[model samples]
Target: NICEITEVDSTLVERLGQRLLPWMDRLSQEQLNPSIYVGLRLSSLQAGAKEAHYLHSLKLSYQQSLLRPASNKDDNDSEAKPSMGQLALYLLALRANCEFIGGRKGDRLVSQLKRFLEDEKRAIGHNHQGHPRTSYYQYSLGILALCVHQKRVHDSVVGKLLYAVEHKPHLLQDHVSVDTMAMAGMAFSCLELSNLNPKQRNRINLALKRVQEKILKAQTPEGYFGNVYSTPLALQLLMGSLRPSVELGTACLKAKAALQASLQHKTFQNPLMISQLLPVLNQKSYVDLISPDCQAPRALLEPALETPPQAKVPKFIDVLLKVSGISPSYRHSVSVPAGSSLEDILKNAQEHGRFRFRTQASLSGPFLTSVLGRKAGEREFWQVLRDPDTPLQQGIADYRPKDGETIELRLVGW
Candidate 1:
């Protein structure tokens, strides 16, 4: 994943780390999920021995995730357990963190994660009749996570996933999730790349080629597999799965250009998407996690906290917020202190009325994703715009509003 940083924003590498580290630190302090917050924090920082003490909290969180079990009910109707996809992510993050920290607790966590994955393989991601569950998306992530940690899963488990990927067309209903497909591609590559019996390796290698071909076929003329969120993942898959060639190189370059354009258009604002894409942009991949270069955690700097923007006297600004949802777009009006940032206004509303806000944590700050009860759909997402339909170049957590300025939140199609 090494490349000349000159091709893109030279400061982006530093900026991403700077932005992410502080926000993750805040989450850890706020006691967000340990696996997620700690894994992200560990990945973001070069926390060598200085952060060794943090490993204890990770152990606690790992135990907590283990203790939480899937309820014995229809997977669709059961809300007792988190989605297999989400749980897989937890395992992936925990595994990566454990690898980075390297301790007795790390060894224990590895054993626990492996056991939990085995339990989940049969317990979820499949229907009662043994058919592929609608949550087929989570299947690959589990395999990929285990592989990233160099943990060997059973051959039957691997074969089941390969079969699932092989028949992706039949299994996929309604709409195709590009991210899921991309993750499946990663799983295929891992199975082929990992040490295994020759028969199993050849089987995975064949499936690996099929997945790569599928991704190449799925790319749009505009050089995108799906949207900005999944494109980076797709690119990573192609880069990792295929050998070097002019065609592959051109595709990578074109995909990179498309991603840059999308960024300029402000098409991707979710922190989670940004976090996922950041590594790809920096020319890194999930494979790097196996032998990640360890470094000491850096100190948090700049944009200290969410303080009021410097402005003149106490002026109440009139604002209009038009929120689009699964139903229809509803408009709102609120008054806030003059010079308040977009986030400040949203915070004011969330605190005062039933209008609630849920933001994903990122290096940039709280990435605003959901408002009220409406969340971002696969193809549709929340985009902030100014009065005359100009998209906000900055995120809600950073962009400030002028006195009397109006802001609109459009649930635009991505």
Candidate 2:
């Protein structure tokens, strides 16, 4: 169900903001990935991501243009397509923090996003031969559909997406890549949010059930899915977004626990060590042997083990949730560890660009609040995402999502 937009907790906001302090200094004030920077900035703003500053003066001026009662821009065509350079269109809009923004520039960007959705619908339609959309396609499309439905932005775009998903039943197969199946699950579930007549709602659930089973079938006994890139992402999606149906959620929880153990153990092996010989702490690989003091990775590793089994989830997800202090509503707050300086972290960040890929962060965060953004560590991780100017070009010629690709579905929400 689409919950009403609520006010964020200021304390939580400050807490999460503190976590971002290191990021503030670490972030290249230079340039950033438009999708990540703009979207996350908007999220922070929505979360009351503010500290008194002269920028507040400019902030009001910025609001003037957005609130300027000049024109309405929602009445236009919208499309969907692959855009790595951009954060997910809907996410970016949420970041913009406007239900609607007017003016040539605002209209232009929103229209482009809308057009991208349209292109996405056409490209993934049934009986299409030139392209067989992949799982990532479904993942991206699901996000768009959810965004549209959640915002009540447009209906036919919703209709077309629903129609295309139902018509192409194969996308949600267990054999499908986990990311693709997860996306199918989300996009299809968005149909339930429909003002769809009761008959249509039932029909939509039928399709959702098919996809759901496929997703269930995809989980390996090891409690993971996806090959390399898709594994962590798929796990995040299945664990985070899908409603915890008694059957699916149980399976997901079991898989999730196993995953947590694996990642937690993995971290112990690769401890963050203060190089006895070096000036600064180096993320040392201690995977080979445990220290007498159980130091390095073990210090970081113990926390994961201590998380009550009830809170069991992947490690990366846990760290992101703890580090950022994300709430159940997806409104983020910042938290900082004691004795950590944002400047020290930023200096280290400069040595290695942490903020780079928005898509992965979006995927990771949305799927599991506690585990799976990217990285394997205990105390420190490479943000690997905030760099905006990195030019993350993802929709490559060979990577396009085609129609009729047989994918697995994990049904949730009937």
Candidate 3:
């Protein structure tokens, strides 16, 4: 591991931590997965979640989520189904906070996680028999979470990934996500440190070598991998390598400097994104998540004590909404608060313009599924665009509309 930082920049960690801990104050309870992880990451540095507020929320939220799989089995209309990625983060969050897994709550949480992965495995290759519900990024998280707790993973489940790396590359290749490979890279590194059969161990070593080579190859001339988004995890991939080389070490230093530059730009606004980047920036990798010596007691959390008052936001912003599901496009205007998100614009639009819409929540946020009485078909989706033809990068809930900007939602296929 390249974690030999004798003189770490404590100033950078404090700046990001101040921004992130306060942001967690506004989160809804059911969605604290990332916040919990971030808080735990900061725990060792004299910073952690407020036990009264953050931990109380964690315990309640944990109880709600722990039973999700059982409820999902009997109820088909559940909004938050058992998500492999979500639960894996929860396990790490609890572990990082020193929530031991020996208690009843701990046992149930771990047991439920296995059920989610076990169910996902049965759908591995049979498309007609109900495809795998989770993404590979999450599937890899499932393996990491189980191994981090020192639990045994089914050889068959582990082998499915070995098969993917060795023989089946196209499924993930078609997607071309460096984040997925970065995650798989970390999981394989952790698995290598665990006990394994002779043949399985040999295959995992090869899988580790092959995937990390691709990560190194994916680095851009700017010293980041793919983009700033995937670069942090890519660094973690090398940071957690079983066999760290000089080339890999050189790659780490450059990418770390690139990321340090990235953090100053104020571009990483999302809590979840910051949570993942916080650990890697500190030279901490998910592979370092073994049981500890019951290290430290946590302190309470709150926003920075002071904030300068700002000019009042203008009462409303004028924006145009266009829906192209019908023959000719329909356009209208809505005036919402200056702080209104694009999703809020549609909500206000429906009140006065007879503009109806619906959505399904995704990992990012609300995914627009229908507008103006038209639903997307199998391959089609509502493509949100700014004026002209620029696609809005963030999901509907995350992207805010500007005054006089035209927001368009066109039903189309990618």
> Quick one: best lDDT, which candidate?
3
Cα lDDT tens digits, model 1, 40-116, are: 34343333332344444444554554444456445644323233444455555554554542366555555654555
- 1-414 in candidate 2: lDDT tens per residue? 111112334343333333333322222212112222222232322212321121232233333332344444674323222242132433333323333334564454455555655565566454443232323354344344334324333444444544545555454433345655555445545445533333456655665665556566666766555422333334433433435576676665555455344433322110000010000011111110111111212111111123245544432210111122112112122222322222223223334443211122322121111212333233222222122222111111112112221111111211
1 against 3, candidate with superior TM-score: 3
After superposition, candidate 3 runs with Cα above 4 Å error:
1-12, 23-28, 38-53, 68-82, 126-131, 173-176, 196-199, 243-254, 292-302, 305-307, 312-341, 344-393, 400-414
lDDT of 2 at 377: 30
Q: Which 10 consecutive positions of candidate 3 have the poorest summed lDDT?
A: 42-51
Model 3 lDDT vs. the true structure? 0.68
Global lDDT scores for all candidate models: 0.58, 0.33, 0.68
| Residue lDDT tens for model 3, 1-414 | 562222336565556566567545544654554434543463334344353466556666766655555445667765454355776776666666655555777678777777777777776753323435666677788888777777667877777766666664434632336777788877787788865434588888898887787777677787777667788678667776566788777776777777778777665655566666666755666776755333544333445788777777767889999988566678889888886889888887888787898997543456799898898876577989998888775667767888889999999853
Better of 1 and 2 by lDDT: 1
lDDT of 2 at 343: 28
lDDT score of residue 16 within candidate 2 = 30
What RMSD does each model have against the real structure?
7.1, 18.7, 4.5
The ten-residue window of minimal lDDT in model 1 covers 1-10
lDDT of 2 at 390: 24
The local distance difference test score of model 1 is 0.58
